[PDB]
């Protein structure tokens, strides 16, 4: 049911997508769904990427 | 063989142009489209020869 709440209308401090475009996320369907988010503090080395 | 060469990634995220166009923006979908184009062109040339 939910979209556009933080997809566009939020203070994007950092928002980086791989394999997909942020603006196209409202038209897609996801399988084996995690859509989960991992809540951590992660120090400050902002190199969480492939 | 020709028909079976269409379901090949050739080093792209997918073998379907519709999925690439739906999931991805043009300036950085161009590279996936390019790899698919090169692979399919090579297969067609081999068939014709």
UniProtKB/Swiss-Prot annotation, chain A:
Domain of life from the UniProt record: Viruses
Region called Integrin-binding motif, residue ranges: 41-43
Annotated phenotype, changing residue 11 to P: In strain: Omicron/BA.1, Omicron/BA.2, Omicron/BA.2.12.1, Omicron/BA.2.75, Omicron/BA.4, Omicron/BA.5, Omicron/BQ.1.1, Omicron/XBB.1.5, Omicron/EG.5.1
Effect of mutating residue 9 to L: In strain: Omicron/BA.1
Resulting phenotype, residue 43 to N: In strain: Omicron/BA.2, Omicron/BA.2.12.1, Omicron/BA.2.75, Omicron/BA.4, Omicron/BA.5, Omicron/BQ.1.1, Omicron/XBB.1.5, Omicron/EG.5.1; complete loss of interaction with host integrins
Function as written in the Swiss-Prot or TrEMBL entry: Attaches the virion to the cell membrane by interacting with host receptor, initiating the infection. The major receptor is host ACE2. When S2/S2' has been cleaved, binding to the receptor triggers direct fusion at the cell membrane. When S2/S2' has not been cleaved, binding to the receptor results in internalization of the virus by endocytosis using host TFRC and GRM2 and leading to fusion of the virion membrane with the host endosomal membrane. Alternatively, may use NRP1/NRP2 and integrin as entry receptors.
Summary of subunit composition and partner proteins: Binds to host ACE2. RBD also interacts with the N-linked glycan on 'Asn-90' of ACE2. Cleavage of S generates a polybasic C-terminal sequence on S1 that binds to host Neuropilin-1 (NRP1) and Neuropilin-2 (NRP2) receptors. Interacts with host integrin alpha-5/beta-1 (ITGA5:ITGB1) and with ACE2 in complex with integrin alpha-5/beta-1 (ITGA5:ITGB1). May interact via cytoplasmic c-terminus with M protein. May interact (via N-terminus) with host bilirubin and biliverdin, thereby preventing antibody binding to the SARS-CoV-2 spike NTD via an allosteric mechanism.
The protein, known as: Spike protein S1
Organism from which the protein derives: Severe acute respiratory syndrome coronavirus 2 (2019-nCoV)
Organismal lineage: Viruses, Riboviria, Orthornavirae, Pisuviricota, Pisoniviricetes
Gene: S
